[PDB]
Design an enzyme around this catalytic site. Structure first.
Site, PDB file in Angstrom:
ATOM      1  CD  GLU A 210       9.740  -3.944   3.046  1.00  0.00           C
ATOM      2  OE1 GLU A 210      10.177  -4.977   2.504  1.00  0.00           O
ATOM      3  OE2 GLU A 210       9.081  -3.072   2.440  1.00  0.00           O
ATOM      4  CG  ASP A 219       1.871  -0.609   5.430  1.00  0.00           C
ATOM      5  OD1 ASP A 219       2.411   0.167   4.612  1.00  0.00           O
ATOM      6  OD2 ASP A 219       0.634  -0.767   5.497  1.00  0.00           O
TER       7      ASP A 219
END
Ligand SMILES: CNC(=O)[C@H](Cc1cccc(Br)c1)NC(=O)[C@H](Cc1ccc(C(N)=O)cc1)NC(=O)[C@@H](c1ccccc1)C1CCCCC1
Ligand SMILES: CC(C)CCC[C@@H](C)[C@H]1CC[C@H]2[C@@H]3CC=C4C[C@@H](O)CC[C@]4(C)[C@H]3CC[C@]12C
Ligand SMILES: CC(C)CCC[C@@H](C)[C@H]1CC[C@H]2[C@@H]3CC=C4C[C@@H](O)CC[C@]4(C)[C@H]3CC[C@]12C
Ligand SMILES: CC(C)NC[C@H](O)COc1cccc2[nH]c3ccccc3c12
Length: 440
Positions: A210, A219
């Protein structure tokens, strides 16, 4: 008949060693960020290769092309003393790096040295001091010289400088200078790779798949996110993400936080995912039926999809609890989560399936940094080990090894001095550094 082709290749080697290593030395000297304990040892390693390419290899090429020695007896006792000095100080530096990296990964300050920058200079001076006695004292005091006639003819002749040594020197000097630091280096750094894999962590696992952004970004779903995958809001408003960021940090951030407060959010979210796994009735039995590795993969999913979303994998939670990892890996592949983010789901499924960290090997940046140090040590071993093995075999059976093979294997170790700057290009930090220096 044709020494030009061999001479040109040798001239390109000297240039690559001098240019490449001065490039590495200057990068550590000019840039304040590169001043670290490891890069201090890199400088010692780069200085050994620079003196190799300046004072050793050029005279070694002239010795081959002319089939004689035209520089006198004094320079050759020096040329041989320097040659043995640079190889001894290189392997001892690598041994010091492996030992220094060992104490860094066994300390709570993972990946950070227990030495100060002043102690690193003391170790480097001691390395060259001990290597200076090992290389110069036997050569200058003539503890190496053999007693047979072909060797004495070369000592009394100024135009002959073949390196003839007695069997005791070739045995002892190879062991004390090369073999002992080599075996310690290979063994100790073998343990660093084990600790990096064994000490692999869910906090480093979530960092890998991540990333870290200390500024607000979007994202894969388009939602505003900051830190290590910390969802701010699902609203398209940027003030909403900024307003929710201020409530979590306690400060008007303008959408920018530091790493000190980014990890505090990350530690909160991981605990929130764990606390949600224990409260959820469906996830609780599976979590208690898993080892520490597969526990980390389950928290990885909850971190990404939430507690309610992970409980949806009804069949997969049966077999992860039933210890049937292989069957659960197939059902986890048959999911929207695999279709959405396959590279992350692949690493998580492998973790569930194998119960190991094989999917996260050398994924963390510090673990990437340790791999390049392994390539420096591995390549140094492959380049010099055939030469030193032939040294020992030549002592046992004298007639077996010819000097054409001896010079060839010696030059395989010679070209190793130019490989270090090329291997350092695996680092984005040196890569940016030499781009600035070369003005690209
Ligand atoms: C606390 N300070 C730091 O950590 C600084 C910060 C920094 C970041 C970015 C640019 C600069 Br300028 C400075 N990083 C550094 O000092 C980096 C850290 C690093 C990052 C990635 C890797 C990898 N993947 O192999 C490796 C190391 N060191 C290095 O590269 C060094 C190095 C050592 C061993 C193997 C490869 C590279 C040196 C190579 C030769 C010339 C000088 C560097
Ligand atoms: C006899 C001659 C030919 C041998 C050459 C010896 C030279 C190259 C040796 C002797 C002392 C060594 C230095 C000792 C200490 C440090 C501190 C470190 O921060 C960078 C490397 C550096 C600066 C070493 C580089 C190499 C060095 C300068
Ligand atoms: C020994 C003879 C025959 C060859 C020439 C030796 C040269 C390459 C050696 C001797 C002393 C060495 C220096 C010793 C100390 C430092 C400080 C360090 O922060 C950067 C490297 C630097 C500046 C070294 C560069 C290389 C160096 C200048
Ligand atoms: C052309 C010749 C002089 N070159 C020497 C090698 O590059 C490096 O050799 C060594 C480095 C370190 C320790 C050593 N012990 C030895 C015993 C015999 C020969 C070389 C070495 C040797």
């Amino acid at each position: 008949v044709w020494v030009v082709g061999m001479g040109i290749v040798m001239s390109l080697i000297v240039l690559a060693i001098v240019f490449g290593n001065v490039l590495v030395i200057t990068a550590i000297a000019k840039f304040e960020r590169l001043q670290t304990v490891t890069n201090y040892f890199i400088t010692s390693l780069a200085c050994a290769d620079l003196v190799m390419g300046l004072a050793v290899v050029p005279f070694g090429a002239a010795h081959i092309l002319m089939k004689m020695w035209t520089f006198g007896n004094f320079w050759c006792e020096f040329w041989t003393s320097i040659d043995v000095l640079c190889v001894t100080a290189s392997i001892e530096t690598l041994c010091v790096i492996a030992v220094d990296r060992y104490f860094a990964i066994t300390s709570p300050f993972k990946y950070q040295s227990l030495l100060t920058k002043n102690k690193a200079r003391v170790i480097i001076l001691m390395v060259w001091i001990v290597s200076g006695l090992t290389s110069f004292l036997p050569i200058q005091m003539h503890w190496y010289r053999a007693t047979h006639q072909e060797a004495i003819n070369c000592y009394a002749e100024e135009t002959c400088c073949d390196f003839f040594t007695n069997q005791a020197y070739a045995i002892a000097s190879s062991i004390v200078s090369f073999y002992v630091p080599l075996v310690i280096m290979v063994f100790v750094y073998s343990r660093v790779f084990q600790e990096a894999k064994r000490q692999l962590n869910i906090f480093e696992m979530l960092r890998i798949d991540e990333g870290l952004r200390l500024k607000i970004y979007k994202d894969t779903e388009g939602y505003y996110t900051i830190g290590i995958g910390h969802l701010l809001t699902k609203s398209p408003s940027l003030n909403a993400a900024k307003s929710e960021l201020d409530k979590a940090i306690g400060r008007n951030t303008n959408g920018v936080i530091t790493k000190d407060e980014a990890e505090k959010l990350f530690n909160q979210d991981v605990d929130a995912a764990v606390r949600g796994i224990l409260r959820n009735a469906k996830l609780k039995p599976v979590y208690d039926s898993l080892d520490a590795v597969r526990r980390a993969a389950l928290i990885n999913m909850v971190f990404q999809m939430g507690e309610t979303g992970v409980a949806g994998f009804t069949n997969s939670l049966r077999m992860l609890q039933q210890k049937r990892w292989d069957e659960a890996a197939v059902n986890l592949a048959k999911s929207r989560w695999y279709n959405q983010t396959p590279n992350r789901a692949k690493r998580v499924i492998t973790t569930f399936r194998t119960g190991t960290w094989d999917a996260y090997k050398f994924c963390l940046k510090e673990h990437k940094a340790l791999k390049t140090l392994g390539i420096i040590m591995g390549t140094f071993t492959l380049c010099w080990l055939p030469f030193f093995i032939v040294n020992i075999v030549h002592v046992i059976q004298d007639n077996l090894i010819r000097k054409e093979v001896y010079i060839l294997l010696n030059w395989i170790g010679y070209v190793n001095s130019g490989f270090n700057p090329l291997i350092y290009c695996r680092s984005p930090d040196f890569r940016i550094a030499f781009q600035e220096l070369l003005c690209l």
